[PDB]
């Protein structure tokens, strides 16, 4: 075949390496990748410390499945240059503290970050899992500190159920892409065993709604 004896073994080396490439690329597609974003003093650590420099990485397994989360908030550099590396992540997990609404005012900073990320071109497809944590202090601040501090316009009376649902509708009304993506909100206090089951319960909705889109059934 006009290949010297030494030349043939270099092809056998290359076809030995293609086996390693697939055999290790078929073990890196079983894991579900998640992205974790949050604002300073929002409570990212609590859900990180709940379940089991650079971009930190975390591995956790629940009911025969492997997830990998990427806590990226320590970059402290411009996000336009490196965020387009993150497409193909299955879901973005955002988290908001409800203890700090009055404290200049963090909530507006949260709103403008969730709005910038929500409508980005790279993340047009991916879905967002919104936690709203630290509600055990948010139950106490309602009476002493009224909700009107964030917005005077809101009419409604100050109840725990009546205020936290209105805030939820403030967050869920920021996405232009109603048809393309959805938001899976969930209230959590400092301790909740059920938190990981809500992520495992929502990633299966995301995976099924992408498998019924890949073949044109939807």
């Amino acid at each position: 075949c006009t290949l010297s004896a030494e030349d043939k073994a270099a092809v056998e080396r290359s076809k030995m390496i293609d086996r390693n490439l697939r055999e290790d690329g078929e073990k890196a597609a079983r894991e579900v990748k998640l992205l974790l974003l949050g604002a300073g003093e929002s409570g990212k650590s609590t859900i990180v410390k709940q379940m089991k420099t650079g971009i930190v990485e975390t591995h956790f397994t629940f009911k025969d499945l492997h997830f990998k989360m990427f806590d990226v908030g320590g970059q402290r550099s411009e996000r336009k240059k490196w965020i387009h590396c993150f497409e193909g992540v299955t879901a973005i997990i955002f988290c908001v503290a409800l203890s700090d609404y009055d404290l200049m005012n963090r909530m507006h900073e949260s709103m403008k970050l969730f709005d910038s990320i929500c409508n980005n071109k790279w993340f047009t497809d991916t879905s967002i899992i919104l936690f709203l944590n630290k509600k055990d202090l948010f139950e106490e601040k309602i009476k002493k500190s009224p909700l009107t501090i964030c917005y005077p316009e809101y009419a409604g009376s100050n109840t725990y159920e009546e205020a936290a649902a209105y805030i939820q509708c403030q967050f869920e009304d920021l996405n232009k892409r109603k048809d393309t993506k959805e938001i899976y909100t969930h209230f959590t206090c400092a301790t909740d065993t059920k938190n990981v089951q809500f992520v495992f319960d929502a990633v299966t909705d995301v995976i099924i709604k992408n498998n019924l889109k890949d073949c044109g059934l939807f």
Binding site: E26, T204, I207, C215, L217
Partner: peptide, 18 residues
């Protein structure tokens, strides 16, 4: 052959792309 595709899409969703 599409019915075999759209059956696997929901029967084994995690493995469907695999």
């Amino acid at each position: 052959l599409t019915a075999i595709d759209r059956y696997i899409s929901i029967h084994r969703p995690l493995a469907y792309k695999r």
